[PDB]
Protein backbone atom coordinates (compact mmCIF):
# COMPACT_ATOMS: atom_id res chain seq x y z
CA UNK A 1 0.00 0.00 0.00
CA UNK A 2 1.18 3.52 -0.88
CA UNK A 3 -0.26 5.13 2.25
CA UNK A 4 1.48 2.65 4.53
CA UNK A 5 4.95 2.96 3.01
CA UNK A 6 4.58 6.75 3.15
CA UNK A 7 3.61 6.78 6.81
CA UNK A 8 6.58 4.52 7.47
CA UNK A 9 9.00 6.97 5.89
CA UNK A 10 7.41 10.34 6.81
CA UNK A 11 5.20 9.50 9.75
CA UNK A 12 1.44 10.12 9.92
CA UNK A 13 1.35 13.10 7.56
CA UNK A 14 -1.68 14.72 5.94
CA UNK A 15 -2.64 14.17 2.27
CA UNK A 16 -1.07 17.46 1.11
CA UNK A 17 2.30 16.69 2.72
CA UNK A 18 4.20 15.09 -0.12
CA UNK A 19 3.21 17.83 -2.57
CA UNK A 20 4.23 20.53 -0.06
CA UNK A 21 7.60 18.89 0.70
CA UNK A 22 8.58 18.20 -2.90
CA UNK A 23 7.58 21.71 -3.97
CA UNK A 24 9.48 23.39 -1.12
CA UNK A 25 12.47 21.26 -2.14
CA UNK A 26 12.21 22.79 -5.61
CA UNK A 27 11.76 26.30 -4.19
CA UNK A 28 14.67 26.18 -1.79
CA UNK A 29 17.03 24.57 -4.28
CA UNK A 30 18.64 27.96 -4.90
CA UNK A 31 19.27 28.67 -1.18
CA UNK A 32 22.76 28.00 0.16
CA UNK A 33 24.47 27.18 3.45
CA UNK A 34 27.63 29.24 3.62
CA UNK A 35 30.70 28.89 5.82
CA UNK A 36 30.96 31.64 8.45
CA UNK A 37 33.72 31.50 11.03
CA UNK A 38 34.15 27.80 10.15
CA UNK A 39 30.47 26.94 10.74
CA UNK A 40 27.52 26.73 8.38
CA UNK A 41 24.83 29.44 8.28
CA UNK A 42 21.83 29.71 5.91
CA UNK A 43 22.33 32.64 3.54
CA UNK A 44 19.46 35.16 3.69
CA UNK A 45 16.73 34.72 1.08
CA UNK A 46 12.94 34.84 0.85
CA UNK A 47 12.47 35.73 4.55
CA UNK A 48 14.24 32.51 5.61
CA UNK A 49 16.13 34.00 8.59
CA UNK A 50 14.00 31.98 11.03
CA UNK A 51 15.40 28.81 9.40
CA UNK A 52 18.96 29.95 9.96
CA UNK A 53 18.17 30.33 13.64
CA UNK A 54 16.41 26.97 13.78
CA UNK A 55 19.10 25.02 11.94
CA UNK A 56 22.12 26.62 13.66
CA UNK A 57 20.49 25.94 17.03
CA UNK A 58 19.79 22.30 16.14
CA UNK A 59 23.44 21.98 15.11
CA UNK A 60 24.46 22.67 18.74
CA UNK A 61 22.43 19.82 20.25
CA UNK A 62 24.40 16.59 20.63
CA UNK A 63 22.68 13.20 20.89
CA UNK A 64 19.47 14.01 19.08
CA UNK A 65 18.04 11.61 16.53
CA UNK A 66 14.82 11.97 14.59
CA UNK A 67 12.30 9.17 14.99
CA UNK A 68 10.94 9.78 11.47
CA UNK A 69 13.20 8.02 8.98
CA UNK A 70 13.04 10.60 6.19
CA UNK A 71 13.78 13.36 8.66
CA UNK A 72 16.74 11.48 10.20
CA UNK A 73 18.15 10.75 6.75
CA UNK A 74 17.84 14.39 5.69
CA UNK A 75 19.36 15.43 9.03
CA UNK A 76 22.43 13.24 8.40
CA UNK A 77 22.73 14.56 4.85
CA UNK A 78 22.65 18.03 6.34
CA UNK A 79 25.38 17.13 8.88
CA UNK A 80 27.43 15.84 5.95
CA UNK A 81 27.07 19.11 4.04
CA UNK A 82 23.87 18.80 1.96
CA UNK A 83 21.04 20.62 3.72
CA UNK A 84 18.35 21.04 1.02
CA UNK A 85 16.19 18.08 2.03
CA UNK A 86 16.36 18.92 5.74
CA UNK A 87 15.41 22.55 5.13
CA UNK A 88 12.46 21.58 2.91
CA UNK A 89 11.31 18.85 5.26
CA UNK A 90 11.28 21.01 8.33
CA UNK A 91 9.39 23.67 6.38
CA UNK A 92 6.89 20.96 5.38
CA UNK A 93 6.38 19.62 8.89
CA UNK A 94 6.15 23.17 10.15
CA UNK A 95 3.54 24.06 7.52
CA UNK A 96 5.75 26.95 6.47
CA UNK A 97 4.96 29.01 3.41
CA UNK A 98 7.82 29.76 1.07
CA UNK A 99 8.70 33.46 1.11
CA UNK A 100 6.86 34.15 4.38
CA UNK A 101 8.53 35.00 7.70
CA UNK A 102 7.89 32.56 10.51
CA UNK A 103 8.45 31.95 14.21
CA UNK A 104 11.85 30.29 14.87
CA UNK A 105 11.01 29.15 18.44
CA UNK A 106 7.79 27.61 17.34
CA UNK A 107 9.45 25.74 14.52
CA UNK A 108 12.38 24.67 16.67
CA UNK A 109 10.05 23.03 19.16
CA UNK A 110 7.97 21.47 16.39
CA UNK A 111 11.11 19.86 15.00
CA UNK A 112 12.41 18.74 18.38
CA UNK A 113 8.99 17.18 19.06
CA UNK A 114 9.99 14.68 16.32
CA UNK A 115 13.26 13.82 17.93
CA UNK A 116 14.52 11.63 20.72
CA UNK A 117 17.68 11.71 22.75
CA UNK A 118 20.47 9.11 22.43
CA UNK A 119 21.27 9.04 26.13
CA UNK A 120 19.45 9.43 29.40
CA UNK A 121 18.04 12.73 30.59
CA UNK A 122 15.65 13.33 33.46
CA UNK A 123 13.76 16.24 34.93
CA UNK A 124 11.80 15.73 38.21
CA UNK A 125 9.32 18.30 39.48
CA UNK A 126 7.98 18.13 43.02
CA UNK A 127 4.52 19.43 43.79
CA UNK A 128 3.43 19.56 47.42
CA UNK A 129 0.61 21.11 49.42
CA UNK A 130 0.25 21.23 53.20
CA UNK A 131 -3.07 19.48 52.62
CA UNK A 132 -2.66 17.26 49.55
CA UNK A 133 0.82 15.95 50.32
CA UNK A 134 3.47 15.32 47.67
CA UNK A 135 3.65 14.15 44.07
CA UNK A 136 6.57 13.95 41.63
CA UNK A 137 6.26 14.66 37.92
CA UNK A 138 9.01 12.98 35.89
CA UNK A 139 10.05 13.95 32.37
CA UNK A 140 12.62 11.91 30.54
CA UNK A 141 14.64 12.16 27.37
CA UNK A 142 14.38 15.10 25.00
CA UNK A 143 11.46 16.41 27.01
CA UNK A 144 13.73 16.83 30.05
CA UNK A 145 16.06 19.06 27.95
CA UNK A 146 13.67 21.73 26.78
CA UNK A 147 11.43 24.13 28.61
CA UNK A 148 9.23 26.94 27.45
CA UNK A 149 8.35 29.91 29.61
CA UNK A 150 11.60 30.85 31.33
CA UNK A 151 15.03 31.88 29.96
CA UNK A 152 17.30 31.38 32.92
CA UNK A 153 18.22 28.36 34.99
CA UNK A 154 17.66 30.36 38.22
CA UNK A 155 14.08 31.02 37.09
CA UNK A 156 13.68 27.38 36.07
CA UNK A 157 14.80 26.15 39.50
CA UNK A 158 12.84 28.75 41.46
CA UNK A 159 10.23 27.42 43.87
CA UNK A 160 6.74 28.37 42.74
CA UNK A 161 4.01 29.07 45.31
CA UNK A 162 0.44 29.07 44.03
CA UNK A 163 -3.22 28.47 44.83
CA UNK A 164 -4.04 24.78 45.06
CA UNK A 165 -7.55 23.33 44.73
CA UNK A 166 -8.70 22.69 48.29
CA UNK A 167 -7.72 26.12 49.59
CA UNK A 168 -4.23 25.41 50.87
CA UNK A 169 -1.07 26.88 49.37
CA UNK A 170 0.59 24.56 46.86
CA UNK A 171 4.30 24.47 45.98
CA UNK A 172 6.15 23.39 42.84
CA UNK A 173 9.89 23.09 42.39
CA UNK A 174 12.48 21.32 40.23
CA UNK A 175 14.21 18.74 42.42
CA UNK A 176 16.40 16.73 40.02
CA UNK A 177 17.86 17.61 36.57
CA UNK A 178 20.41 15.66 34.51
CA UNK A 179 20.77 16.54 30.79
CA UNK A 180 23.40 16.85 28.02
CA UNK A 181 22.18 20.41 27.34
CA UNK A 182 19.22 22.61 28.17
CA UNK A 183 17.12 24.74 25.84
CA UNK A 184 14.99 27.46 27.48
CA UNK A 185 12.59 29.55 25.34
CA UNK A 186 10.49 32.60 26.16
CA UNK A 187 8.93 35.61 24.50
CA UNK A 188 11.30 38.25 23.13
CA UNK A 189 13.04 39.72 26.12
CA UNK A 190 15.29 42.77 25.98
CA UNK A 191 18.61 41.99 27.72
CA UNK A 192 22.05 43.54 27.63
CA UNK A 193 24.15 40.47 26.88
CA UNK A 194 27.78 40.89 27.80
CA UNK A 195 30.80 38.68 27.86
CA UNK A 196 32.34 40.55 30.77
CA UNK A 197 29.93 38.74 33.12
CA UNK A 198 31.03 35.45 31.49
CA UNK A 199 27.53 33.98 30.91
CA UNK A 200 26.45 30.41 31.72
CA UNK A 201 24.65 30.00 28.40
CA UNK A 202 26.50 29.03 25.18
CA UNK A 203 24.08 30.28 22.54
CA UNK A 204 20.84 32.18 22.12
CA UNK A 205 18.52 33.41 19.43
CA UNK A 206 17.54 37.03 18.99
CA UNK A 207 14.24 38.44 17.75
CA UNK A 208 14.16 41.67 15.75
CA UNK A 209 10.91 43.50 15.16
CA UNK A 210 7.72 44.20 17.05
CA UNK A 211 7.35 41.54 19.76
CA UNK A 212 3.67 40.64 19.02
CA UNK A 213 4.65 39.55 15.53
CA UNK A 214 6.67 36.95 13.73
CA UNK A 215 10.03 38.65 13.49
CA UNK A 216 13.41 38.35 11.96
CA UNK A 217 15.99 36.30 13.81
CA UNK A 218 19.73 36.25 14.48
CA UNK A 219 21.53 33.24 15.93
CA UNK A 220 24.30 33.99 18.48
CA UNK A 221 26.99 31.72 19.93
CA UNK A 222 29.39 32.38 22.83
CA UNK A 223 32.97 31.51 21.95
CA UNK A 224 36.44 32.74 22.84
CA UNK A 225 35.13 35.44 25.13
CA UNK A 226 32.91 36.91 22.38
CA UNK A 227 29.34 36.88 21.10
CA UNK A 228 29.40 35.55 17.52
CA UNK A 229 26.35 36.87 15.65
CA UNK A 230 25.20 34.83 12.64
CA UNK A 231 22.85 36.94 10.70
CA UNK A 232 21.79 34.64 7.88
CA UNK A 233 25.11 34.09 6.13
CA UNK A 234 27.18 36.91 7.68
CA UNK A 235 29.08 36.76 11.01
CA UNK A 236 30.24 39.55 13.29
CA UNK A 237 31.66 39.45 16.78
CA UNK A 238 31.02 41.67 19.76
CA UNK A 239 31.59 41.75 23.54
CA UNK A 240 28.24 43.42 24.22
CA UNK A 241 24.79 43.36 22.64
CA UNK A 242 21.49 44.85 23.72
CA UNK A 243 18.93 42.62 22.07
CA UNK A 244 15.64 40.76 22.48
CA UNK A 245 16.44 37.19 23.41
CA UNK A 246 14.09 34.28 22.77
CA UNK A 247 15.74 30.87 22.96
CA UNK A 248 18.68 30.34 25.25
CA UNK A 249 20.90 27.27 25.21
CA UNK A 250 22.71 26.08 28.39
CA UNK A 251 25.27 23.34 28.99
CA UNK A 252 24.26 19.94 30.43
CA UNK A 253 22.57 20.05 33.85
CA UNK A 254 23.58 17.94 36.85
CA UNK A 255 21.34 19.22 39.63
CA UNK A 256 19.71 18.02 42.85
CA UNK A 257 17.80 20.37 45.17
ZN1 LIG B 1 -4.06 21.10 48.22
Author numbering: 63 to 319
Question: Which passages does the manuscript contain on this structure?
Answer:
We also report the first X-ray crystal structure of a CoV PLpro or PLP2 without its flanking Ubl2 domain. The 60 amino acids encoding for the Ubl2 domain at the N-terminus and a single cysteine from the C-terminus of PLpro were removed. PLpro-ΔUbl2 crystallized in space group P 1 2 1 with one biologically active monomer in the asymmetric unit. X-ray data were collected to 1.95 Å, and the final X-ray data collection and refinement statistics are summarized in Table 1. The MERS-CoV PLpro-ΔUbl2 structure contains only the catalytic domain of PLpro with its three subdomains: thumb, fingers, and palm. Similar to the MERS PLpro-Ubl2 structure, the catalytic Cys111 in the MERS-CoV PLpro-ΔUbl2 structure is also modified by β-mercaptoethanol (BME) with a partial occupancy of 0.83. Due to the partially modified Cys111, His278 is observed to occupy at least one alternative position in order to accommodate the bulky, modified Cys111 residue. The MERS-CoV PLpro catalytic domain is observed to adopt a conformation that is nearly identical to the structure with the Ubl2 domain intact. The resulting root-mean-square-deviation (RMSD) is 0.4 Å when the Cα of 254 residues in PLpro-ΔUbl2 are aligned with Cα of 258 residues in PLpro-Ubl2. Truncation of the Ubl2 domain appears to cause only slight deviations in the ridge helix of the thumb domain due to the loss of two helix residues, Thr61 and Ala62.
